[model samples]
Target: KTIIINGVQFNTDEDTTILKFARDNNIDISALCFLNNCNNDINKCEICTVEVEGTGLVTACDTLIEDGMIINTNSDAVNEKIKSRISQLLDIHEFKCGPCNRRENCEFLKLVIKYKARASKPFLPKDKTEYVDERSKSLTVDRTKCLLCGRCVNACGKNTETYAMKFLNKNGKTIIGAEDEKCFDDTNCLLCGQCIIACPVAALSEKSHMDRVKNALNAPEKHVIVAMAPSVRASIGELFNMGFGVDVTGKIYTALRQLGFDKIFDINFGADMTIMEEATELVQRIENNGPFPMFTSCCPGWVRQAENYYPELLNNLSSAKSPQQIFGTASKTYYPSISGLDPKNVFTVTVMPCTSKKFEADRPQMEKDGLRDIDAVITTRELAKMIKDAKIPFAKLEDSEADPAMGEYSGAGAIFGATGGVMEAALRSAKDFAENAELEDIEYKQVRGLNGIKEAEVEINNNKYNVAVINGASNLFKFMKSGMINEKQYHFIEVMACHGGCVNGGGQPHVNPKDLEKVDIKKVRASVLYNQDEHLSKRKSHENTALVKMYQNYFGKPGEGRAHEILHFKYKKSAWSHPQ
Candidate 1:
């Protein structure tokens, strides 16, 4: 349809909202509650009200622009209509910034500013909610801080396709919660935490475990052993205003020592052990009539999601604890046996880039050595907070090496922080096992970089092995529902909870790109993992001499009696424990 706007002819389409058409043409049209085909109900925000054919009043977001329709966007009457609509929203809504973290970037805040809304002429009856902080599993939400914007609902429904959460009640009585009071751990909702990121305000924040960690660190009776995951090295340094993707392995160790940790260990050793078990398991699963496309269990978020949503497919999940968990279990058991420290005296703390690890660490089944394998979980961001709180000058911090015995790592182990690092590390060993010969060159470029899902086939030792590695939940959905699971499609698969792997983990330092545009998070964080791999003499995990010696002296073989007790775990359906 054709219309004359501001005395200029413009082409129009049927069933197109004025706001949408204007946005398509790069025209700015004001919209308050309009969700652009995402919301369930048509928004009544009259800010986009425009003259419609045979209609006295209509919202442009709800009205269809048709043939010969003439719309006037700017006029005293329309402006007054918008002003009245803004006044209504302002009157009903109560603003609170006391505990909100999204001080500037919140769209809800922007809408208020755009409308130039002042305190309502007379305050209307406002719905006040008693903010309930409960659970020990994931993030906490304050009902009062929520603006009823539906971003979280939209994200939960769209991102993971779970549809487990939604707004309830009507009008002023609306609130966000899972149906039937189902905990996130018990629902079909995948706790990917994208919804946590999608929330316009800081109503959602990971339950802080830093203070508990600090208490343990200061306890003289406790021997705090800190184990950092492979991905932490890539992103943790950024919290100190260090370069993104800069390997802070040395600095991380130095900081932990300064924090009063009795021992600082590397999770890469567990990554090596993971590869050893996972690769052997893949071969065994293939040899037997076991489940094909056995999903890697390194990502705790993925594991929790599968348990919540894909319970039927639980058999398909590899019963391997994440390398971080594996590291903790080993430290509290095997390492202590070697170090002669009692498990009661040893307080194991794992520093990880993923926030979900906190939930994973607190799992009741994670108990080993008569105590929790991982006592306290701190994200990379929280660690930085602790360092700053203690007044540790990161710029002047001394560089110290990790415990040489268990801390030695390879480029293969280091790359585990990036998207396809796990698959690449496993493939290095798989090629050796399949070829029955040493691999001279170790880099597998096909399985590297930031692709959501990557697949490769190689004829090693005259046997074609197909492998697939997926980094994000969206990509996992594509692979899981793609009808390719049972066609001998993938002999091996690697999956990480966060996009671009743990380097950009939810717990890692967050970079608000509003200021630094050139700072690409995925690229910057990935560089450190790959660069460390490039510099390492031993690029393969299996070839690490420490691992070789450990196997020769202590742990007999991967996934054996001792190894299984220390490194393996059994996950079952249970109650959701989260922060209150």
Candidate 2:
């Protein structure tokens, strides 16, 4: 089909909408309610309407392209339509522009500036009251700032299958509300924060740990130490307006040093520790042949979901703690003892790319000796905020390495940030451990991609082991169900709650809807870690010198007395229930 957009002819498919054609052809069209990623156009906002010849004004998002359609996206009618829809939304929304946290990156504000729809006086809807649900430790929801766009609801229901959010008609106004008034912790909510990123405004955000971290930094008696995840390094540069996936690990070290941290460490060091213990555990399970198909426990969100929904299969979960927890344990116990500092005065802070890390840090089981292993867990966005508050010129800062002691990491540790990374790293080490010799090639190409579920049969010493890599919560249920029904089918499973693993975590830099259409940010960020893995000298976790020394000097070996005590944890089923 052929369509004329502002007197320019374009060839497009008949099923393609005017908005899609415009966007595909690089034509600018403002859309607040339209989610290109979600592929849902309810036509509720009517902000993307254009003047169509012989059809009057129609929604560009809903109207299909005809064989000979003449569309005027820049006409006066189109501008009026855009302005009217924005004004209507403003009338219903509780707007406090400056005070709002999302004022800088708000989609509503972007549209307002794009169309010049200025309001002389703000309207307050007496019928619609502001609502804030702050019951969850990991997340907060402000219904007043919500645009009733349903992005959050769709993200939770469609992708996560949690259904923790829903639309409600309250006081004659439709608003996004919690499901059954249940607190997020009590619901099936994974606290993955996918809904938070899907939200276009300040409706959803992670709970703040800035005050805790700042207070710790200000206290001279408190020795603050920060450790950053591999994924954080790959994605944090985007916060400073740098290109996506630019590795800023060195820059991050420089910035955190400027922020008054007593010591800095890399979580990849713990990642190596995770691989050493996890791989050793996997070999033991295979030898025992009882708890078949051990699941990786690196992702906290995935671990929580497993606890809540698939508790029957809890025995299959690897007892190995995540890299963050492992880092916290070492920093709180080993680092303080080695440095001749009191463990009570040492405060451990972790920078991660997931909201669930905050919840993970707060778990009672994660504490030892009456002190939490990690004092505070902050997201990559929160770290960016701290840098901005400190007036640090992040982009201009010279690259610097992390502080000594647990700073050295292997390439295998670096790839733990991406999906299938853990499986690949483990397989590399598993083969070496089984054969009693190092494998020449380490990359497991079969499981390395963006697919929801990946499976491969890996053979070691004439014995075959079935393996799988799973991303997203939806696939978690499907894979677990299939595995349980057909028992002993897989020997190992790697599950990440977020669709593309920690590199695309909820707390990373927000990718505007427009940028999503232009690139797959998740894959790009994952590549940064993979590239780092390729360029590094030691590509195997078992080859990490620092981890080996730690084991030799203190922990002895993987799954031994000290390693089991510090690097392993148990998961139990959640007690959430609905009233009869």
Candidate 3:
């Protein structure tokens, strides 16, 4: 391949394209409409034109390299030909806002803006057909903006292999559509919103609840209370020019205050509370034998995926609602009581890292005080947009603390942002359950790192307690498929649908794939939570003095009647379907 690009004569692989051969040998070539592994038709766009051994110009994405194929890339002659072809392609293409989820860091979008080539003069606007699939409740398709890169289709059916949505129609009207006319709420969709991340443009989008949230905050009679999720604090910062996984937790508090939210509560406190309850529940289940494998119920995306894909396994899910909903239940009841405010006037909102939190927020069982526990749900991405629209200088803003009653959290609470964090947190309490035995290593190194699945064994009472932590719904597909067939048994499973857990959630900051490949995104963001955990005077949830006092003075023990009504939740078998 290098022999052809470097003006030499040698044998080359037949399967590899000219672009691949050039790229492999460190030759730089520009190609518009030329992504990897696709049919490279330069006629549609000739950004990848190269002179090959007396052959004038050819598209690199599609072109094949062979033995003794001499290719010229740096010739002034070839450069002129490329320039003319680029000009022709430019004339037929209108560059409005570039189609991208990671608009803040899009290389192609940035290049186009830098070059200032923003018109399609000869090519009139095409009135192509628009295809919208109300089928997926979490996403809608707008074909007009699709670059036809097929990233979404690839992620949905190819990478994850869910096959929920697919390309339909052909030619100019070709677009993505569901197989059946059923809506996502009615289908087997996981509601992970991966397709939205896959879409290069706003071709796919989570239902925007920003306007509704803004209106609630602006209402004079209502007290808008925003609870920030653990993962959200680290991810939201990236949307505001902060690097990925950078902790803007304090800045987020300041920004929300600037947004007119009456109080900014940390969902970490609720997460800690979840640890207290879930850990105790584990003991209870072990003793009582209610449900054997108690799956963690904190990730809305994971919960929805489980409901749709593994319905019978619903028995394994914890009765506890997620930390976000836990905040809402506590917000309307606990915060209002502690602050001496009317519960009816306080509007609870969850700033979460999953789009499925919207669905979780709307569940009937999520209600308390005669109303839905969470009044509104907004993703981290939406909060950043609100901050931008409000013109808040987020980076310059001073760090701020959360509201009083619901603000306090332990280090275990902070670590819930990543996969296997819950298992570690629960183990913090489980160690106490095992006669105050000290954990040899606080960092369960096996489960702490990012991969897809992690399994570890703990010996208690001379018996093994098997645990598994699975990140990404796609990973879950593999594990669940195998587990079902083999009848595998586990004591606990910590599941988060997005790869790398909530840190890389669909609703979190959408970093450019290049940045993700180059930067250690999961580690950077996770370190914030880890740092918070390390600095915390108390490492375990059970060790939290305030939480211990709250339970002793008010709520009684973990599974007490008051705690059950106020702190715990039950799951309902959702109607959504899934792949077998």
Candidate 4:
């Protein structure tokens, strides 16, 4: 069908919306509710009104394109209604975009600029009141800043299967919040933070730890050590205006060194250590027939969800601590003695691509001797802010290697940043352990895609193994329900709470809706890790020389009592617990 949009005739589908056709043809159409293909044509917001040849005025997002139909997206009638809608929203909104953290990237602000909508310049409402909800452990909710667009509710329900949020209509006021007004932790909230990215305003955000990290950096008596997660290296560059999925591992280390960290390390090193422990457990469980399908415990969010909702299956979770906690343990214990620094004065800081890691760092199981393994946890986005605030030119900085002794890692470790990567990495080690030989064919292509749930069957040393990988919380729950009905099905399972794994984590930069509509940010970021893994010299975790040295010098071999003392943890029923 040929449609004339703003006097430009173009061929489009009959089912295509006028807004979509315009956007596809590079025609700018300002619409907040119609973002990322998330809108279901509810037509709640009249800001997308366009003057059609036959139809006087209609929402372009809900209007279908027809042959020879002329649509004027920027007509005087459309602008008048859009301006009036903006005024209505501004009347209820608190109008704090000037000081909001999301000000620069906010879609609502972009729409205001695009249509020259006067929000507060011409008039400010005196009767408007603000509502703030900061009861959640990982995020804040400001009802005053919300557009009541239903995006957050849609994200939580659609992506995470957690209908923890809803739109409540009360006293002529529309508000978006958790059901029953309960805090996030008490609800079925996964803390994955998809809601934050879906929000068009400052209605949602992660709780920050920037001040704590800054204090640790300024303390003269403490020795601060920092480590960056594998996914972080691929995503942090976006905050510096670098393209998505750009790897800046070396540049990140350089920035940390210049930011006053005494030593810089890679969490991929810790991931190697995790594989060492997790793979051993997988082998033992299979041999002894203990917990037919063992679940990977590397994802803190997934672990938390299991403990809170599926407490009966707690035994199915791997006892190995996550890479972040494992690195914290080694940094304080092994690195202290190796570097001649007192463990008491060591402050371990970790940079992750997830917000739940902030909650994970404070878990009781993650602490030893009453000292938290990780003193501070900062997100990839937060670290980028620090670099920018410190006036460090990230793009111009020379790439540097991570400080030695605990920095070296394998490609298997590097791939842990992506979904199904844990399963692939573990399969590589598991096959080696079972066959008693290093397998040259390390790639497990069966489990490396963007599907929500993936399954594979393999034979190792004449032993048939059943495995599965779940990318999001919803898929994990579905598999768990089915697996519970039939106990002896899968031998192993990997679940990452975030869709597409840690690469699309809550702590990474928020992708704008326009980009999200065109591409899968998660897949793009995951590809960077997979590409890095292909090029690395060492592709298996057991091949990391640094891990070998650490086991020999400090802790005993994998699964030993000494290794378990520091590198392992157990889950119990709790509303909140620090790492023990």
Minimum summed lDDT over a 10-residue window in model 1 is located at 509-518
Clashing pairs in 1: 135-578, 135-579, 136-577, 136-578, 136-579, 137-577, 137-578, 411-533
Candidate 3, superposed: residue stretches over 4 Å from native: 4-27, 30-108, 111-137, 170-172, 434-440, 484-488, 572-580
Please estimate how well model 2 matches the true structure, expressed as its whole-model Cα lDDT.
0.83
Candidate 4 residue-wise lDDT, 1-580, digit = tens: 8788888878755578888878877887777776646663443787778898876888877677888888888888888899888877776667666667777677777777766666554434454434777676677787777787888888777777767777776567667777676777667777778788778888788877888888988989888889989899889888888888788888888999999998888889999999999998988887897676788998977987787678766778888889999999888889987888988888988898888888788776677777788888888878988898899999888999987688888999999988899999998998898788988999999998789888889887887888889988878777766764264488888999988899988888888877877777988898889988999999999999989999988898797788987899878664556672
Find the 10 residues in a row with the least total lDDT in model 2.
35-44
lDDT of 1 at 420: 90
lDDT of 1 by residue, 1-580 (tens): 7965545578755467776776666565676444415433533556676655455556777666777877777666676777777666556454665445555345556656776766565443354334644463665666655556576676566545666667777355777767655566566655556566555555655667877787887888889888888878777766676666566778788888888888878888778877777766666676573566677888887776678656665666666667777777767766776788877888888887776787888887788647887888877766877777778887667789888556777777778878899888877886786667787877889987778778888665676778888877766776678865555667677777667787766666645422233567777878878888888888887888887777777777776676665677655565556862
Q: Evaluated with TM-score, which candidate comes out highest?
A: 2
Against the true structure, candidate 3 has what lDDT?
Answer: 0.72
Error of 3 at 102 (Å): 7.1
Model 1: how far is 316 from its true place, Å? 3.4
Specify the highest-lDDT model's number: 2
Candidate 4, run of 10 with poorest lDDT? 121-130
Instruction: Please provide the root mean square deviation of candidate 1 (C-alpha atoms, Å).
Output: 5.8
Error of 4 at 340 (Å): 2.7
